[PDB]
Design a protein around this ligand. Structure first.
Ligand SMILES: [Mg+2]
Ligand SMILES: [Mg+2]
Ligand SMILES: [Mg+2]
Ligand SMILES: [Mg+2]
Ligand SMILES: [Mg+2]
Ligand SMILES: [Mg+2]
Ligand SMILES: [Mg+2]
Ligand SMILES: [Mg+2]
Ligand SMILES: [Mg+2]
Ligand SMILES: [Mg+2]
Ligand SMILES: [Mg+2]
Lengths: 50, 31, 107, 153, 63
RNA sequence: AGAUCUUGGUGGUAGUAGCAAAUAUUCAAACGAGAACUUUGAAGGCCGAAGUGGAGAAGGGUUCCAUGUGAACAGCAGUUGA
């Protein structure tokens, strides 16, 4: 909602920050074995547990 | 100053619709 | 010549008979396009917005029975399309439809 | 790359290939069987006619529920259709093959489609929603296409 | 090209609805450069953006 | 070889059922490789103030706003997009 508490806002802030693609140069590392960010979250597909 | 061709093209340039629509008043190109 | 302009009257009533209410005005313009294509032999037919408005003047289902149009075949020099000729069809307002023939018109 | 049916003489031949193309495999297979063996000019004209609904492709194997048409009588058959997307994809592959022939230096006015083949591609998954809270597949059926043209007059 | 943003801005500047915003169909390329409300005001002054009049709902029949 | 066996994959069905609740679209132009669907203009309509309007609470959590892309997604398409 528009009315939210500080803890809720901070939790949403962390989720928003960590929902982003991997940097391109990660795939160039030695023994990388990571293709994409499998933990991507869309607001409409999966809802936060909160 | 106005002339026959100037008014002939002005008639087309003014109407921006059919009957019952407001005629165009002005059109300027300025910097 | 191939840049001829002529004046026709189309029996929209005849061409639109039997069509349902919500499809009468659209099919009137489809039939006008077919008429222009058949009479001028150009697949590229462009309908003047005033003619479209005249066809749609009385709503979607009460289309005018007859329409007076002007088919002008023109050179499509605007671009290098496969159709080098197009036909612009324009509305000719009239007061009566009696004794109107297909007449060639000058410039 | 590995084509099936390598040409008998790969100096008067040109090849074209496409993978995971988003057209229906059955329609494309019928269109390929129709244009197989044609001259390249004849095939181009026929595919454009199929796009314009002036000539049809006869549906011979995958014809369950396919309706009848009058144009199917030129083919020795009864059921025909006008797969526009398949015709467009085959036209693009024909243009690619013609460009390859020009690069190889053999004249294109004598090219004949000697080999054409449509293979099933991996299916793309989508979702559909049914009556009582059920989920069913809504899969696509893309196809790989390959063709070899040769010169013969 | 596409003037979805310009019609939205002109509606706010003219303080009317998007029904009444008239964008010059011929000067499409000039209006497309107006990405700010200040540019919209300039186009409104220069006649490229016009507020169409209210649709006539006469009361003469009732009178 | 069986167990309405477990897991995975694949057929026929089948290019089939189907993409039919809430009246409705049309003309011209622009961009664009490409336009039934985008945008602009002109018409014709609908919601008809107990709204298909303007704003909030709960809930959502960045969906808001610009620019760009055209892979996938938006059960047709898209130059559009939550
Ligand atoms: Mg939900
Ligand atoms: Mg059957
Ligand atoms: Mg369903
Ligand atoms: Mg359910
Ligand atoms: Mg077994
Ligand atoms: Mg069916
Ligand atoms: Mg149905
Ligand atoms: Mg009403
Ligand atoms: Mg509301
Ligand atoms: Mg948005
Ligand atoms: Mg789709």
């Amino acid at each position: 909602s528009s009315h939210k508490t500080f803890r809720i806002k901070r939790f949403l802030a962390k989720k928003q920050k960590q929902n982003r693609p991997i940097p391109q140069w990660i795939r160039m590392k030695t023994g990388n074995k990571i293709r994409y960010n499998s933990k991507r979250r869309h607001w409409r597909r999966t809802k936060l547990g909160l | 100053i106005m002339n026959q061709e100037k008014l002939a093209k002005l008639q087309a340039q003014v109407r921006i619709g059919g009957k019952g629509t407001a005629r165009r008043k002005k059109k300027v190109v300025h910097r | 010549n191939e840049v001829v302009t002529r004046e026709y009257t189309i029996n929209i009533h005849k061409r639109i008979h039997g069509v349902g209410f919500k499809k009468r005005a659209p099919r009137a313009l489809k039939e006008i396009r077919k008429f222009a294509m058949k009479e001028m032999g150009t697949p590229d037919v462009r309908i003047d917005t005033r003619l479209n408005k005249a066809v749609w003047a009385k709503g979607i289902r009460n289309v005018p029975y007859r329409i007076r149009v002007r088919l002008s075949r023109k050179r499509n020099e605007d671009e290098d399309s496969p159709n080098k000729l197009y036909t612009l069809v324009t509305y000719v307002p009239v007061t009566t439809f009696k004794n109107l023939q297909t007449v060639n018109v000058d410039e | 790359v590995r084509y099936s049916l390598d040409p008998e003489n790969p100096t008067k031949s040109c090849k074209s290939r496409g993978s995971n193309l988003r057209v229906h495999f059955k329609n494309t297979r019928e269109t390929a069987q129709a244009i197989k063996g044609m001259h390249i000019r004849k095939a181009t004209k026929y595919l454009k006619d199929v796009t314009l609904q002036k000539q049809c492709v006869p549906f011979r194997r995958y014809n369950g529920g396919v309706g009848r048409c009058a144009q199917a009588k030129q083919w020795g058959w009864t059921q025909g259709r006008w797969p526009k997307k398949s015709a467009e994809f085959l036209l693009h592959m024909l243009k690619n093959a013609e460009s390859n022939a020009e690069l190889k230096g053999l004249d294109v006015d004598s090219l004949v489609i000697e080999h054409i083949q449509v293979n099933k591609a991996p299916k793309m998954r989508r979702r559909t929603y049914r009556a009582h809270g059920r989920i069913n597949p809504y899969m696509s059926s893309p196809c790989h296409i390959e063709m070899i043209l040769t010169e013969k007059e | 090209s596409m003037l979805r943003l310009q019609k939205r801005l002109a509606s706010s500047v003219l303080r009317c609805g998007k029904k009444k915003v008239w964008l010059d169909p011929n000067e499409t390329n000039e209006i497309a450069n107006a990405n700010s409300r200040q540019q919209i005001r300039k186009l409104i002054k220069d006649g490229l953006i016009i507020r169409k009049p209210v649709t006539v709902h006469s009361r003469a029949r009732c009178r």
